[PDB]
Amino acid sequence: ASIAQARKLVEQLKMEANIDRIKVSKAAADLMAYCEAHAKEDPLLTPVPASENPFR
Amino acid sequence: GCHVDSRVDHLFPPSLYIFVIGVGLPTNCLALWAAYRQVQQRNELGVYLMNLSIADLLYICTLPLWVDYFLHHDNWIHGPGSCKLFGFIFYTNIYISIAFLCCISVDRYLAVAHPLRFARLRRVKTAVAVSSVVWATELGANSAPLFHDELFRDRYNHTFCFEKFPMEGWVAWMNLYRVFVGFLFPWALMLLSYRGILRAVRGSVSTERQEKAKIKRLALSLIAIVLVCFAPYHVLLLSRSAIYLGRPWDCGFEERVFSAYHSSLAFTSLNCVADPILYCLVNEGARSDVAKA
Amino acid sequence: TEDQRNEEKAQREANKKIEKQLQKDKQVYRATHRLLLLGADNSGKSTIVKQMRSGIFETKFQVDKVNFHMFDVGGQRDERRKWIQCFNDVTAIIFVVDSSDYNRLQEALNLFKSIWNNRWLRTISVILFLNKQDLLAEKVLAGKSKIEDYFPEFARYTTPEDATPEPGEDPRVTRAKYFIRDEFLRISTASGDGRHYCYPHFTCAVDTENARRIFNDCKDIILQMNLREYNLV
Amino acid sequence: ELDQLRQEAEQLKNQIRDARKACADATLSQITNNIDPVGRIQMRTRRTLRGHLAKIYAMHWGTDSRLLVSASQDGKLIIWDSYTTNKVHAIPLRSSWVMTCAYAPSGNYVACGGLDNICSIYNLKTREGNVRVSRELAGHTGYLSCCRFLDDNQIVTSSGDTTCALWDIETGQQTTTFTGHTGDVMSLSLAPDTRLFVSGACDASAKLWDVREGMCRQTFTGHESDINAICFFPNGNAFATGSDDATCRLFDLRADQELMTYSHDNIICGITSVSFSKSGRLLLAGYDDFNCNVWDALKADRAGVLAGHDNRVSCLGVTDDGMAVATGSWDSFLKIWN
């Protein structure tokens, strides 16, 4: 059983080994761009008039 | 037809009356605020405390005219109707406050003695029903002075207001009722409730003797202050009523007990000081409530 | 629009019906006490539930017209540190202990202490039943194993006063009773400001006296928070 | 052979660490260091929903952005009407220990579950108008933690047995299973395209999955205690996690590494709920300090505190149109902040 669990651990590590990995900075930039692109349409970040606010 | 006396009276009962005017007002309003916040958390004690504070505020507001009553010489005179209403309030608010003290004692006893019972009686709706019933019964039972004029006096340099020393007949029996049903019975129940609370508290397995001692001292203060603040005035009231009922023509008894009657009517106003601080300020949780205030 | 007003009126009628249902729910919810049972495999954790009666084995019992309802979470793994937070508002946590073998009292103390110094269990008055008292009593008396070998403080103690009066006045069994008691009290009575308590009890698997004991201790906890609630301290 | 296999696993882990170290070009805080800070988000309790009896453990909003579901520890599933402060329905539940509730995108059904290890389906928009059970789901050996409606006839469930699974709502079978974690899975989030989903666990690990297949792809390890909450960024990439070590960490898929940490010295208790706004600039989180801190997702600063709850804040969610935040807490109240 320990041998089998070691085999499963090593095969999982092997599949996780070769995954195509790109730079972290690109991912951070993507997150920043998507945070920025939808800023106007966010009521929690831009106040909504009471006329258009169903909760007020 | 009775001669009277006393010179300090110009300021004697006025002294303690001005004292209680000065002290009891902010304490009573902060007690009202704490009561309202207790109501906010679905606690039935808050309604009772708030009504107690309201009655205390009314009495403190209506006191100054009756302070003037003597500052002249037991002789104010501003018309029959004003005296009629203000004497009524000034002699009813004490009994209203004491009835709400009885209500508070009963409510406190209910939770500590029986922690898992009487769910319906521990509700805000029942509180606001019982408080309304109490107000209605108090005004109805004290309404008897309304039918009579309230500007009687004796002919010896004196125009009284709501208080005739050569008193009539009905006022004596209302005095006896006011003492016996109106002072003792609520106070007796108020002492019984804390006796039961102490009996429950001392038998607590999760409470050491330190908390027991602190609770004991608080309960002792609450029960003991009222008796000293109230007893002498009602003793003199009962004495005069009995003497006049036995023999009204013996004016000498009034002539001597004049000083006792109002030097004690002075002391009767100290409960308006006792109740607010001793019910809100001292308690540690209510001290946190005062900090939140 | 008449249909608009009809829709609003239907909204209000449904709202009134749901408000009545919610008030009934509030009453029935406030008139009940929930408990949690936390024992050990060798102990009779589930035994007392049946005695006083996939996943949760719920139980329902009633003492003096007051509703009690405890839950025994046993369809889970060895890990306990997450679903334990569900039972934060219960009246009390019943921690049954496995006082069978000294090799199992150490994790018993560790579990008492981790429950004690927990974020959400410091206000919960746990109940100590000291389950499997008979195994401890019959084997520390028989011998072949010394508590000194596990916790080297057994000998320097004497008979506790009236701790379960025994026909045989054996100091060893009673002082082992209260030695494990004070082992739990090392942080049962050290850490804590009085919000909770320990309520020591000694029970076997057959006592038929735990439901009422829990009810009395619940009365004590409610008395304490009524003392604190009604500004009477 | 066992020692050789252990050495093999060791060198595989070492090479993985070397690859990640090479790929660690920069962190999030370095790049996101020049944008304007959000500032003090001073929201107010516009609505106070007082219908719940016990602490709120889970809530979810419907697609219409008005009808929202909520589950508390008393055993209730109250359907609310936000606009009119009304209650459309009040669904009782078989099991009180509910830790997650789901609202169908169409609105015809509601899903709930918890310690019972069962996911239940109810009937919301019936012809008769009465809510009744439609079916049940069984097959998990641990307590349910999160479940969401995949599109309309599938559902993804998470459990404490270190597994996640996919169901078919027509036939009632567990089509696919996802294994690989070693600790309890706490929170679960779904991508917009409904082709991948991510979940944290109580082992300082996060893993991503493919729904069509049954294979784990990526793992990320950055914490020192149990992870307890996760939410998916709107763009379909990356996520955010909180943990019992009082430090919240942001991850990313293609980076395959930890990016940014939100922490402070004063805060001792950990994060218990995470959610994202419509834009993704705001990062909302619940704490055991009875507060709700508004982190800027890219600045690691406390730019906002949602005071008002006097007990631990457990719930967190945003609307489809982004017009409200619902904050269920251990004070048995639901508040709408706008």
Author numbering:
A (entry chain C): 7 to 62
B (entry chain R): 8 to 300
C (entry chain A): 9 to 61, 205 to 384
D (entry chain B): 3 to 340
Quote the paper:
Among the over 800 known human G protein-coupled receptors (GPCRs), three specific receptors — GPR4, GPR65 (T-cell death-associated gene 8 or TDAG8), and GPR68 (ovarian cancer G protein-coupled receptor 1 or OGR1) — were identified as proton (H+ ion) sensors regulating signaling within acidic microenvironments. The three proton-sensing GPCRs exhibit different responses to extracellular pH variations, and each receptor has distinct preferences for G protein-mediated signal transduction. GPR4, in particular, is responsive to protons and engages with various G proteins, playing critical roles in angiogenesis, endothelial cell inflammation, and cancer cell metastasis suppression. Conversely, GPR65 is activated at relatively lower pH levels, primarily signals via the Gs pathway, and is implicated in chronic inflammatory diseases such as inflammatory bowel disease and certain tumors.
To elucidate the G protein coupling versatility of GPR4, we determined the structures of chimeric miniGs/q-coupled GPR4 activated at pH 7.5 (pH7.5GPR4–Gq) and pH 6.8 (pH6.8GPR4–Gq), and miniG13/iN-coupled GPR4 activated at pH 6.8 (pH6.8GPR4–G13). These structures were solved at global resolutions of 2.9 Å, 2.7 Å and 3.4 Å, respectively. In the GPR4–Gq complexes, the receptor at pH 6.8 (pH6.8GPR4–Gq) adopts a similar conformation to that in the pH6.8GPR4–Gs complex. Furthermore, additional long tube-like densities were observed in the cavity formed by TMs 3–5 in the Gq-coupled GPR4 structures, suggesting potential lipid binding. The intracellular conformational variations result in distinct receptor–G protein interactions on their coupling interface, with GPR4–Gαs forming the largest interface area of 1230 Å2, followed by GPR4–Gα13 (1017 Å2), and GPR4–Gαq (1114 Å2). Notably, L12334.51 in ICL2 is buried in a hydrophobic groove formed by the αN–β1 junction, the β2–β3 loop, and the α5 helix of the G protein, in Gs-, Gq- and G13-coupled structures.
